[PDB]
Amino acid sequence: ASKRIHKELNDLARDPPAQCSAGPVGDDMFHWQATIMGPNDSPYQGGVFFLTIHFPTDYPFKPPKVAFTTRIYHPNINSNGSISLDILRSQWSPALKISKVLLSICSLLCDPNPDDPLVPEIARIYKTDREKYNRIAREWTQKYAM
Amino acid sequence: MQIFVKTLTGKTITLEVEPSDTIENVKAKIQDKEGIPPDQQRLIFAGKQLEDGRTLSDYNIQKESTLHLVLRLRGG
Amino acid sequence: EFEFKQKYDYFRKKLKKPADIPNRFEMKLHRNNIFEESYRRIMSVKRPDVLKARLWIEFESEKGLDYGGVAREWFFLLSKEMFNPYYGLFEYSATDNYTLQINPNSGLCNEDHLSYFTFIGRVAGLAVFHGKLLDGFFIRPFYKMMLGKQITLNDMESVDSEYYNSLKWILENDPTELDLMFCIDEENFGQTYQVDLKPNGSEIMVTNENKREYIDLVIQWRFVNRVQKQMNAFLEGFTELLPIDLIKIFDENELELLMCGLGDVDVNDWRQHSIYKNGYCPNHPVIQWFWKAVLLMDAEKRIRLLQFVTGTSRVPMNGFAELYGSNGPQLFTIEQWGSPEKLPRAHTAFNRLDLPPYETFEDLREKLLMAVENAQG
């Protein structure tokens, strides 16, 4: 896990995943914090979002726990910043790397997944009343992201 | 052409189809014999997830080939 | 199911009752200090044969004239004590699995843990012998260990799916890119120290020439190395009531059903500790049906239902109020989602169930009993 994390860390400052930057804060190497810039021409445009990448001692056999810190109005991310993303749970592989988990998250941001929701209310509003959704998401970004 | 779709419980779905049916339609047919919607279905065959964009010819799903009904329920 | 019956009775009879022993076993102790009291009593008997006597128990507290029903209770009461995670002899495999396994660091909790294990075994067998059940469940490897079976990468799937899949990957691919080393990591006091699976493992790498011998050292470590003394002391006592071989006829699943029972989920404690989000609440029509649906299921459909939704088929020792998410306490939840056509979904991490607003009780039941049965894939 040590060399794994360390090495995976240098690889970040090798090909910085565009639109985001995660890195260990403090001296603890099992607690990182990442940023993700609202994908462009998406309602989350302009804002910035903070996250918490907590590596368990079982990494990489167990997926890392990644959560949003910054509030965000999205169908697959709740008020705790919990992220319903398959590679974080069911489809995780010891070969997968953070730089890949971050971009995967930026994708979920611009192109939500309304059919495997975590927050039903939003999913619906996103399916039926799409323009409403953009209005709101855009407002939440103005409150907690900026 | 006749095939079997086995559920994880045991009960099996015998059905009628042309070798050119898009997998997506095997689901539309299963959606009337069980009520199970298509977006919550996964038909596994010999350890392979048979996409919707293909047909019964693309995977050589012939007369009597058994696929499976593994319900994609868990959410994300 | 229909078979297990044959094997059971056939098993029951094969057991024999000595002759030179009392009609019953004299047992009387206080409920509030039941552990060390049952302990000092059983573990003091000279002839381990006498425990094959009839079970006669009385509490100097809740004196009620049953004395035959107390038997069922004593076991249920001694279990919550023997198999209590916070005692230190046994612990939970995961923070959300509720299945017990020998605590490798047990010797550092009871300065004479071995004697205690021998006892928990002494009792455990005593229950099988008198057709009673113990309360709690152990990870498969515990049972395999009794059956004298090997523990393999396979056995870890039940304990920690994700860890099993990751190991299996290592098994089926080249693990030189993962940059692994022969040593897993630990925690205590927030401290994070490294531990070697073998000599200097900390240095040694996991190549494509040793990843076989690696996965071994891992399983070896996770379920065997550090608990062989205990698991052994346990069998010593378990075999002072039953011939350890008389039991090999059953398989892990049957052996579990044999001594730990099936374990039907208490439906009332459950409804009473569930929370409803997004429209649903205690009296809402759909929620009221859900529970009636639950009420009509048999012991299996329920445990199936629980697993489908919480990820585990077991329930915490202190009830449904102590349920856990992959993030800490998380009461069984039921949220409203989807059109009446869709099947109910589940998030095992938050023990949540997305139940669509069915229109007719029977409509709901046919959809739930469907998700449950044809599920787990």
Curated annotation (Swiss-Prot), chain A:
Catalytic residues as annotated in Swiss-Prot or TrEMBL: S84 (glycyl thioester intermediate)
Function (record text): Accepts ubiquitin from the E1 complex and catalyzes its covalent attachment to other proteins. Catalyzes 'Lys-48'-linked polyubiquitination. Mediates the selective degradation of short-lived and abnormal proteins. Functions in the E6/E6-AP-induced ubiquitination of p53/TP53. Mediates ubiquitination of PEX5 and SQSTM1 and autoubiquitination of STUB1 and TRAF6.
GO CC, one annotated term: nucleus
Protein origin, superkingdom: Eukaryota
Name by which UniProt lists this protein: Ubiquitin-conjugating enzyme E2 D2
InterPro entries: UBQ-conjugat_E2_core (IPR000608), UBQ-conjugating_AS (IPR023313), UBQ-conjugating_enzyme/RWD (IPR016135)
PROSITE patterns on file: UBC_1, UBC_2
Family: Belongs to the ubiquitin-conjugating enzyme family.
Record keywords, A-Z: ATP-binding, Nucleotide-binding, Transferase, Ubl conjugation pathway
SMART domains: UBCc
Pathways involved: Protein modification; protein ubiquitination
Swiss-Prot record, chain B:
Residues forming coiled coils: none
Effect of S65G: Phosphomimetic mutant that can recruit PRKN to mitochondria
Subcellular location: Cytoplasm; Nucleus
Name of the gene: UBA52
Organism expressing this protein natively: Homo sapiens
Sequence position, cross-link Glycyl lysine isopeptide (Gly-Lys) (interchain with K-? in acceptor proteins): G76
Modification ADP-ribosylglycine occurs at: G76
Highest classification ranks of the organism: Eukaryota, Metazoa, Chordata, Craniata, Vertebrata
Effect caused by changing H68G: Loss of DTX3L-mediated polyubiquitination of histone H3 and H4
Entry-annotated residues carrying Phosphoserine: S65
PTM: Phosphorylated at Ser-65 by PINK1 during mitophagy. Phosphorylated ubiquitin specifically binds and activates parkin (PRKN), triggering mitophagy. Phosphorylation does not affect E1-mediated E2 charging of ubiquitin but affects discharging of E2 enzymes to form polyubiquitin chains. It also affects deubiquitination by deubiquitinase enzymes such as USP30.
Residues of the full protein shown: 1 to 76 of 128
Residues with the (Microbial infection) ADP-ribosylthreonine modification: T66
Boundaries of every Ubiquitin-like domain copy: 1-76
Marked site: Essential for function: H68
Site (Interacts with activating enzyme): residue numbering on this chain: R54, R72
Protein name as annotated: Ubiquitin
Cross-link entry Glycyl lysine isopeptide (Lys-Gly) (interchain with G-Cter in ubiquitin), positions: K6, K11, K27, K29, K33, K48, K63
Listed result of changing R72G: No effect on ADP-ribosylation
Function in brief: Exists either covalently attached to another protein, or free (unanchored). When covalently bound, it is conjugated to target proteins via an isopeptide bond either as a monomer (monoubiquitin), a polymer linked via different Lys residues of the ubiquitin (polyubiquitin chains) or a linear polymer linked via the initiator Met of the ubiquitin (linear polyubiquitin chains).
Curated annotation (Swiss-Prot), chain C:
Inducers of expression: By androgens in prostate, and by albumin in kidney.
Record domain HECT: where: 47-377
Keyword Acetylation applies: yes
Positions annotated as active site in the UniProt record: A349
Processing and modification events after translation: Phosphorylated by SGK1 or PKA; which impairs interaction with SCNN. Interaction with YWHAH inhibits dephosphorylation.
UniProt GO BP: monoatomic ion transmembrane transport; negative regulation of potassium ion export across plasma membrane; negative regulation of potassium ion transmembrane transport; negative regulation of protein localization to cell surface; negative regulation of sodium ion import across plasma membrane; negative regulation of sodium ion transmembrane transport; neuromuscular junction development; neuron projection development
Subcellular location: Cytoplasm; Golgi apparatus; Endosome, Multivesicular body
Impact noted for substituting Q101H: In PVNH7; increased degradation; changed function in regulation of TOR signaling
Biological role stated in the UniProt entry: E3 ubiquitin-protein ligase that mediates the polyubiquitination of lysine and cysteine residues on target proteins and is thereby implicated in the regulation of various signaling pathways including autophagy, innate immunity or DNA repair. Inhibits TGF-beta signaling by triggering SMAD2 and TGFBR1 ubiquitination and proteasome-dependent degradation. Downregulates autophagy and cell growth by ubiquitinating and reducing cellular ULK1 or ASCT2 levels.
Protein's recorded name: E3 ubiquitin-protein ligase NEDD4-like
Gene this chain is encoded by: NEDD4L
Whole-protein residues included: 596 to 970 of 975
